[PDB]
Design a protein around this ligand. Structure first.
Ligand code: HEM
Length: 154
């Protein structure tokens, strides 16, 4: 809810490692999300027809959209919680157009933490993970607040 400057630096130190291969991370994150939570795939009319992990990895539009995800997320994270202006277009389209429940943001957050671990075994330790979780929690909480502002979600 408030992160220390140290936790923010951990988050941004890790994020520079994402920005080194945004496509790879975005792809992996989306695939982890769809594998571990197939219900989220159904929300993508563009991808719902991708079934094996092998198909997802070969979809360049899935990879493109991972880039879309992560660059939007990275913009937010670089604001270190001063992200109201960035969240509202995101909350607006995910509440009202995509109709994404906040719970699915929790799933993709777990997918992010997981993919960060498999792509950075020695870099993503307990501290950075604690920090990244706080930052994604703050993100989720502020998105949820923005949902209710738009009059949405339980
Ligand atoms: C870190 C969390 C997330 C970020 C930063 C993010 C960001 C974005 C962005 C930038 C777009 C493109 C513009 C827009 O439509 O708003 C998008 C589209 C979309 N998002 Fe997300 N999203 C996140 C989580 C999720 C989750 C978990 C789901 C569904 C389970 C979802 C469902 C969708 C859908 C269906 C679209 C339209 C996709 C398409 O055009 O094929 N989002 N998202």
């Amino acid at each position: 809810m408030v992160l220390s400057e140290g936790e923010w630096q951990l988050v941004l130190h890790v994020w520079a490692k994402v920005e080194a291969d945004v496509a790879g991370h975005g792809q992996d994150i989306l695939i982890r999300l769809f594998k571990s939570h197939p219900e989220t795939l159904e929300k993508f009319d563009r991808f719902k027809h991708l079934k094996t992990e092998a198909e997802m990895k070969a979809s360049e539009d899935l990879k493109k959209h991972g880039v879309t995800v992560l660059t939007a997320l990275g913009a937010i994270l670089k604001k270190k919680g001063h992200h109201e202006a960035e969240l509202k277009p995101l909350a607006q389209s995910h509440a009202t157009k995509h109709k994404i429940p906040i719970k699915y943001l929790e799933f993709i957050s777990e997918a992010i933490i997981h993919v960060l671990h498999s792509r950075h075994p020695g870099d993503f330790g307990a501290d950075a993970q604690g920090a990244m979780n706080k930052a994604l929690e703050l993100f989720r909480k502020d998105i949820a607040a923005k949902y209710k502002e738009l009059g949405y979600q339980g």
